[PDB]
Amino acid sequence: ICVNENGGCEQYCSDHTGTKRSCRCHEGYSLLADGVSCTPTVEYPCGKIPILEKRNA
Amino acid sequence: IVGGKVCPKGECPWQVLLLVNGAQLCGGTLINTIWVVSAAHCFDKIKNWRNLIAVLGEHDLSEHDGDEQSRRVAQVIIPSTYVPGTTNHDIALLRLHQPVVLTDHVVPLCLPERTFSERTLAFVRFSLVSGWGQLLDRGATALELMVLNVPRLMTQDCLQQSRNITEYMFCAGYSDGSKDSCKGDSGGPHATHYRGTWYLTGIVSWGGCATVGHFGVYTRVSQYIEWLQKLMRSEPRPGVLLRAPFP
Ligand SMILES: O=C(NCc1cccc(-n2ncc(-c3cc4cncnc4[nH]3)c2O)c1)Nc1ccccc1
Numbered sequence: 140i141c142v143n144e145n146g147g148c149e150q151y152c153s154d155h156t157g158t159k160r161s162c163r164c165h166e167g168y169s170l171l172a173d174g175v176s177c178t179p180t181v182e183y184p185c186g187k188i189p190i191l192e193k194r195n196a
Numbered sequence: 197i198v199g200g201k202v203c204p205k206g207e208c209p210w211q212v213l214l215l216v217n218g219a220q221l222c223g224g225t226l227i228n229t230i231w232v233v234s235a236a237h238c239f240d241k242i243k244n245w246r247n248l249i250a251v252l253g254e255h256d257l258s259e260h261d262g263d264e265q266s267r268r269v270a271q272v273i274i275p276s277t278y279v280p281g282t283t284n285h286d287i288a289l290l291r292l293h294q295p296v297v298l299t300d301h302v303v304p305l306c307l308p309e310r311t312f313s314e315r316t317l318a319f320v321r322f323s324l325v326s327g328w329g330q331l332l333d334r335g336a337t338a339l340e341l342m343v344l345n346v347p348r349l350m351t352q353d354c355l356q357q358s359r360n361i362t363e364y365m366f367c368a369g370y371s372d373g374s375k376d377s378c379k380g381d382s383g384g385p386h387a388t389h390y391r392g393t394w395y396l397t398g399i400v401s402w403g404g405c406a407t408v409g410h411f412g413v414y415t416r417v418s419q420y421i422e423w424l425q426k427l428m429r430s431e432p433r434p435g436v437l438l439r440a441p442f443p
Pocket residue numbers: 221222237238239240241280281282377378379380381382400401402403404405
Protein backbone atom coordinates (compact mmCIF):
# COMPACT_ATOMS: atom_id res chain seq x y z
CA ILE A 140 0.00 0.00 0.00
CA CYS A 141 2.77 2.44 0.98
CA VAL A 142 4.45 2.19 -2.41
CA ASN A 143 1.28 3.43 -3.98
CA GLU A 144 0.00 6.93 -3.49
CA ASN A 145 2.05 6.90 -0.32
CA GLY A 146 -0.49 4.58 1.14
CA GLY A 147 -2.69 7.62 1.36
CA CYS A 148 -0.45 8.94 4.14
CA GLU A 149 0.36 12.66 4.33
CA GLN A 150 3.83 11.77 5.58
CA TYR A 151 5.38 8.43 6.54
CA CYS A 152 3.94 5.01 5.78
CA SER A 153 4.56 1.55 7.19
CA ASP A 154 3.37 -1.74 5.73
CA HIS A 155 2.13 -4.51 7.97
CA THR A 156 1.25 -8.14 7.68
CA GLY A 157 -2.01 -8.23 5.84
CA THR A 158 -4.02 -5.51 4.20
CA LYS A 159 -2.58 -3.46 7.04
CA ARG A 160 -1.02 -0.01 6.88
CA SER A 161 0.09 2.56 9.44
CA CYS A 162 0.73 6.22 8.69
CA ARG A 163 3.09 8.21 10.83
CA CYS A 164 4.14 11.79 11.35
CA HIS A 165 7.45 13.53 11.85
CA GLU A 166 8.36 14.80 15.30
CA GLY A 167 6.45 18.03 15.94
CA TYR A 168 3.36 16.55 14.31
CA SER A 169 0.50 14.31 15.37
CA LEU A 170 -1.64 11.93 13.33
CA LEU A 171 -5.33 12.75 13.04
CA ALA A 172 -8.20 10.32 13.51
CA ASP A 173 -8.42 9.87 9.73
CA GLY A 174 -5.23 7.89 10.25
CA VAL A 175 -3.49 9.71 7.41
CA SER A 176 -3.25 13.42 8.18
CA CYS A 177 -0.54 15.18 10.17
CA THR A 178 -1.09 18.32 12.19
CA PRO A 179 1.62 20.43 13.90
CA THR A 180 1.99 20.12 17.64
CA VAL A 181 4.62 22.83 17.95
CA GLU A 182 5.07 26.41 16.91
CA TYR A 183 7.79 25.72 14.38
CA PRO A 184 7.42 22.26 12.86
CA CYS A 185 9.91 21.19 10.23
CA GLY A 186 9.25 21.92 6.60
CA LYS A 187 6.71 24.65 7.12
CA ILE A 188 7.22 28.32 6.30
CA PRO A 189 5.77 30.48 9.10
CA ILE A 190 5.30 33.69 7.11
CA LEU A 191 3.35 31.72 4.56
CA GLU A 192 1.39 29.64 7.04
CA LYS A 193 0.38 32.85 8.75
CA ARG A 194 -0.40 34.43 5.43
CA ASN A 195 -2.94 31.68 5.16
CA ALA A 196 -4.18 31.49 8.72
CA ILE B 197 22.33 30.22 -8.33
CA VAL B 198 21.93 31.00 -12.02
CA GLY B 199 18.60 31.96 -13.52
CA GLY B 200 16.72 32.00 -10.26
CA LYS B 201 15.14 34.67 -8.14
CA VAL B 202 15.54 36.17 -4.70
CA CYS B 203 14.06 33.91 -2.06
CA PRO B 204 11.74 36.26 -0.22
CA LYS B 205 13.04 36.84 3.27
CA GLY B 206 11.85 34.05 5.50
CA GLU B 207 10.68 31.75 2.73
CA CYS B 208 13.90 29.78 2.84
CA PRO B 209 14.17 29.53 6.62
CA TRP B 210 16.21 26.31 6.69
CA GLN B 211 19.02 27.78 4.60
CA VAL B 212 22.38 27.97 6.31
CA LEU B 213 25.40 30.08 5.46
CA LEU B 214 28.77 28.64 6.40
CA LEU B 215 31.67 30.99 7.03
CA VAL B 216 35.36 30.47 7.62
CA ASN B 217 37.24 33.45 9.02
CA GLY B 218 34.18 35.49 8.13
CA ALA B 219 34.40 34.49 4.49
CA GLN B 220 31.64 32.68 2.61
CA LEU B 221 32.47 28.96 2.42
CA CYS B 222 29.33 27.09 1.53
CA GLY B 223 25.66 26.58 2.10
CA GLY B 224 23.89 24.20 4.43
CA THR B 225 20.52 22.94 5.59
CA LEU B 226 19.12 23.05 9.11
CA ILE B 227 17.37 19.77 9.99
CA ASN B 228 17.12 20.25 13.76
CA THR B 229 18.07 22.94 16.27
CA ILE B 230 21.64 21.65 16.47
CA TRP B 231 22.13 19.79 13.21
CA VAL B 232 23.09 21.03 9.79
CA VAL B 233 23.60 19.06 6.59
CA SER B 234 26.14 20.27 4.07
CA ALA B 235 28.64 18.95 1.51
CA ALA B 236 31.80 17.10 2.51
CA HIS B 237 33.99 18.88 -0.04
CA CYS B 238 33.34 22.18 1.72
CA PHE B 239 35.76 21.03 4.38
CA ASP B 240 38.57 19.58 2.30
CA LYS B 241 40.88 22.51 2.97
CA ILE B 242 39.94 23.65 6.43
CA LYS B 243 42.99 24.68 8.39
CA ASN B 244 41.58 25.95 11.62
CA TRP B 245 38.52 23.86 12.31
CA ARG B 246 37.73 26.26 15.07
CA ASN B 247 36.93 29.18 12.85
CA LEU B 248 33.89 27.57 11.23
CA ILE B 249 30.63 29.44 11.70
CA ALA B 250 27.05 28.62 10.75
CA VAL B 251 24.56 31.41 10.23
CA LEU B 252 20.80 30.92 10.33
CA GLY B 253 18.12 33.47 9.48
CA GLU B 254 20.44 35.07 6.93
CA HIS B 255 19.06 36.84 3.89
CA ASP B 256 20.89 39.98 2.79
CA LEU B 257 24.62 39.72 3.39
CA SER B 258 25.03 43.49 3.23
CA GLU B 259 23.02 44.23 6.34
CA HIS B 260 22.22 43.07 9.80
CA ASP B 261 18.52 42.96 10.60
CA GLY B 262 18.65 40.97 13.80
CA ASP B 263 17.03 37.77 12.55
CA GLU B 264 20.48 36.29 12.02
CA GLN B 265 21.80 33.67 14.40
CA SER B 266 25.43 32.59 14.43
CA ARG B 267 26.80 29.42 15.93
CA ARG B 268 30.18 27.76 16.09
CA VAL B 269 30.46 24.39 14.43
CA ALA B 270 31.41 21.85 17.08
CA GLN B 271 31.56 18.82 14.83
CA VAL B 272 31.92 18.05 11.15
CA ILE B 273 31.05 14.44 10.32
CA ILE B 274 31.87 12.96 6.95
CA PRO B 275 31.38 9.43 5.58
CA SER B 276 34.39 7.17 5.48
CA THR B 277 33.68 6.58 1.82
CA TYR B 278 34.16 10.19 0.83
CA VAL B 279 37.44 11.02 -0.89
CA PRO B 280 38.52 14.67 -0.76
CA GLY B 281 38.39 16.53 -4.02
CA THR B 282 35.82 14.17 -5.44
CA THR B 283 32.04 14.00 -5.84
CA ASN B 284 30.82 10.66 -4.49
CA HIS B 285 29.41 10.66 -0.96
CA ASP B 286 29.52 14.46 -0.92
CA ILE B 287 27.75 14.95 2.38
CA ALA B 288 28.53 16.29 5.83
CA LEU B 289 26.68 16.44 9.11
CA LEU B 290 27.44 19.41 11.30
CA ARG B 291 26.79 19.74 15.01
CA LEU B 292 26.35 23.30 16.28
CA HIS B 293 27.99 24.33 19.58
CA GLN B 294 24.64 25.59 20.78
CA PRO B 295 21.13 25.17 19.38
CA VAL B 296 19.62 27.83 17.21
CA VAL B 297 16.33 29.29 18.40
CA LEU B 298 13.41 28.51 16.13
CA THR B 299 11.71 31.65 14.84
CA ASP B 300 9.69 32.81 11.86
CA HIS B 301 13.05 33.14 10.12
CA VAL B 302 14.73 30.02 11.39
CA VAL B 303 13.07 26.65 10.80
CA PRO B 304 14.43 23.17 10.08
CA LEU B 305 13.73 21.29 6.88
CA CYS B 306 12.31 17.81 7.51
CA LEU B 307 14.73 14.96 7.06
CA PRO B 308 12.45 12.33 5.56
CA GLU B 309 12.25 8.61 6.17
CA ARG B 310 14.14 6.70 3.54
CA THR B 311 11.17 4.74 2.34
CA PHE B 312 9.08 7.85 1.97
CA SER B 313 11.90 9.62 0.19
CA GLU B 314 12.53 6.76 -2.17
CA ARG B 315 8.94 5.78 -2.89
CA THR B 316 7.41 9.22 -3.02
CA LEU B 317 9.65 12.26 -2.87
CA ALA B 318 11.92 10.89 -5.58
CA PHE B 319 9.00 11.16 -7.97
CA VAL B 320 8.14 14.77 -7.25
CA ARG B 321 9.33 16.47 -10.43
CA PHE B 322 10.29 19.91 -9.21
CA SER B 323 12.27 20.95 -6.18
CA LEU B 324 13.92 24.11 -4.93
CA VAL B 325 17.64 24.81 -4.70
CA SER B 326 19.09 27.85 -2.98
CA GLY B 327 22.18 29.77 -2.01
CA TRP B 328 24.34 32.87 -2.14
CA GLY B 329 26.47 31.42 -4.89
CA GLN B 330 27.53 32.88 -8.23
CA LEU B 331 24.72 34.45 -10.24
CA LEU B 332 26.67 33.54 -13.36
CA ASP B 333 29.50 31.30 -14.41
CA ARG B 334 32.68 33.24 -13.63
CA GLY B 335 30.50 35.85 -12.00
CA ALA B 336 30.02 37.55 -8.66
CA THR B 337 28.16 35.88 -5.80
CA ALA B 338 24.73 36.92 -4.60
CA LEU B 339 24.15 39.37 -1.77
CA GLU B 340 20.55 38.19 -1.41
CA LEU B 341 19.58 34.55 -0.98
CA MET B 342 18.54 33.09 -4.31
CA VAL B 343 16.27 30.20 -5.15
CA LEU B 344 15.61 28.08 -8.19
CA ASN B 345 12.98 25.53 -9.19
CA VAL B 346 14.63 22.54 -10.88
CA PRO B 347 13.30 19.29 -12.31
CA ARG B 348 14.75 15.95 -11.36
CA LEU B 349 15.83 13.37 -13.89
CA MET B 350 16.07 9.63 -13.53
CA THR B 351 19.74 8.83 -13.88
CA GLN B 352 19.18 6.91 -17.09
CA ASP B 353 17.51 9.89 -18.62
CA CYS B 354 20.18 12.18 -17.30
CA LEU B 355 22.91 10.30 -19.03
CA GLN B 356 20.96 10.26 -22.25
CA GLN B 357 20.11 13.93 -22.25
CA SER B 358 23.66 14.90 -21.41
CA ARG B 359 25.95 16.17 -24.14
CA ASN B 360 29.82 9.61 -13.72
CA ILE B 361 26.55 9.58 -11.86
CA THR B 362 26.45 7.12 -9.02
CA GLU B 363 23.59 5.75 -7.00
CA TYR B 364 24.57 8.30 -4.38
CA MET B 365 23.71 11.10 -6.72
CA PHE B 366 21.03 12.51 -8.90
CA CYS B 367 20.56 14.96 -11.71
CA ALA B 368 18.37 18.01 -11.69
CA GLY B 369 17.96 21.19 -13.65
CA TYR B 370 18.42 22.22 -17.27
CA SER B 371 20.73 21.50 -20.17
CA ASP B 372 20.17 24.82 -21.91
CA GLY B 373 22.63 26.66 -19.74
CA SER B 374 20.05 29.06 -18.39
CA LYS B 375 19.47 27.66 -14.92
CA ASP B 376 21.63 25.92 -12.38
CA SER B 377 23.26 25.85 -9.02
CA CYS B 378 26.72 27.33 -9.09
CA LYS B 379 29.95 27.79 -7.23
CA GLY B 380 29.18 29.15 -3.79
CA ASP B 381 25.97 27.15 -3.54
CA SER B 382 27.54 23.85 -2.51
CA GLY B 383 26.12 22.25 0.62
CA GLY B 384 22.84 24.00 0.14
CA PRO B 385 19.40 22.37 0.07
CA HIS B 386 17.51 20.65 -2.64
CA ALA B 387 14.08 20.77 -1.02
CA THR B 388 10.99 18.94 -2.10
CA HIS B 389 7.38 19.73 -1.35
CA TYR B 390 4.82 17.08 -0.58
CA ARG B 391 1.33 17.61 0.70
CA GLY B 392 2.06 20.87 2.41
CA THR B 393 5.46 20.09 3.84
CA TRP B 394 9.04 20.42 2.66
CA TYR B 395 11.73 17.76 2.84
CA LEU B 396 15.47 17.41 2.28
CA THR B 397 16.13 15.34 -0.85
CA GLY B 398 19.40 16.73 -2.11
CA ILE B 399 22.59 18.58 -1.38
CA VAL B 400 24.18 20.92 -3.92
CA SER B 401 27.48 19.23 -4.76
CA TRP B 402 30.04 20.22 -7.36
CA GLY B 403 31.40 19.61 -10.81
CA GLY B 404 29.83 22.82 -14.09
CA CYS B 405 27.84 25.99 -13.68
CA ALA B 406 25.03 26.41 -16.17
CA THR B 407 27.11 24.47 -18.66
CA VAL B 408 25.19 23.77 -21.84
CA GLY B 409 24.50 20.11 -22.39
CA HIS B 410 24.81 19.40 -18.69
CA PHE B 411 22.73 18.98 -15.57
CA GLY B 412 23.26 19.88 -11.95
CA VAL B 413 24.45 17.09 -9.72
CA TYR B 414 23.11 16.56 -6.24
CA THR B 415 23.91 14.25 -3.38
CA ARG B 416 21.08 11.74 -3.01
CA VAL B 417 20.16 12.29 0.62
CA SER B 418 17.91 9.22 0.74
CA GLN B 419 20.98 7.01 0.75
CA TYR B 420 22.15 8.67 3.97
CA ILE B 421 19.06 8.89 6.14
CA GLU B 422 19.97 5.98 8.37
CA TRP B 423 23.57 7.15 8.59
CA LEU B 424 22.48 10.64 9.63
CA GLN B 425 19.93 9.40 12.11
CA LYS B 426 22.41 7.18 13.88
CA LEU B 427 24.91 10.02 14.14
CA MET B 428 22.33 12.41 15.54
CA ARG B 429 21.75 9.94 18.40
CA SER B 430 25.45 9.75 19.19
CA GLU B 431 27.52 11.64 21.76
CA PRO B 432 29.97 14.30 20.52
CA ARG B 433 33.62 13.36 20.28
CA PRO B 434 36.66 15.54 20.83
CA GLY B 435 38.09 17.03 17.68
CA VAL B 436 35.92 18.84 15.17
CA LEU B 437 36.44 16.51 12.21
CA LEU B 438 34.99 13.02 12.49
CA ARG B 439 35.07 10.39 9.80
CA ALA B 440 32.22 7.96 10.36
CA PRO B 441 31.75 4.60 8.71
CA PHE B 442 29.42 4.41 5.82
CA PRO B 443 27.16 2.63 5.51
O1 LIG C 1 39.56 22.28 -2.52
C1 LIG C 1 38.72 21.49 -2.11
N1 LIG C 1 37.70 21.90 -1.32
C2 LIG C 1 37.61 23.30 -0.92
C3 LIG C 1 36.31 23.96 -1.26
C4 LIG C 1 35.55 24.56 -0.26
C5 LIG C 1 34.36 25.19 -0.60
C6 LIG C 1 33.92 25.23 -1.91
C7 LIG C 1 34.70 24.63 -2.89
N2 LIG C 1 34.29 24.67 -4.22
N3 LIG C 1 35.11 24.89 -5.34
C8 LIG C 1 34.39 24.85 -6.43
C9 LIG C 1 33.05 24.61 -6.04
C10 LIG C 1 31.86 24.46 -6.87
C11 LIG C 1 31.75 24.52 -8.22
C12 LIG C 1 30.33 24.29 -8.50
C13 LIG C 1 29.54 24.23 -9.65
N4 LIG C 1 28.25 24.00 -9.52
C14 LIG C 1 27.68 23.84 -8.34
N5 LIG C 1 28.38 23.89 -7.23
C15 LIG C 1 29.69 24.11 -7.27
N6 LIG C 1 30.63 24.21 -6.30
C16 LIG C 1 33.03 24.50 -4.66
O2 LIG C 1 31.95 24.27 -3.90
C17 LIG C 1 35.89 24.00 -2.58
N7 LIG C 1 38.79 20.18 -2.41
C18 LIG C 1 39.79 19.62 -3.21
C19 LIG C 1 40.54 18.57 -2.70
C20 LIG C 1 41.53 17.98 -3.46
C21 LIG C 1 41.79 18.45 -4.74
C22 LIG C 1 41.05 19.50 -5.25
C23 LIG C 1 40.05 20.09 -4.49
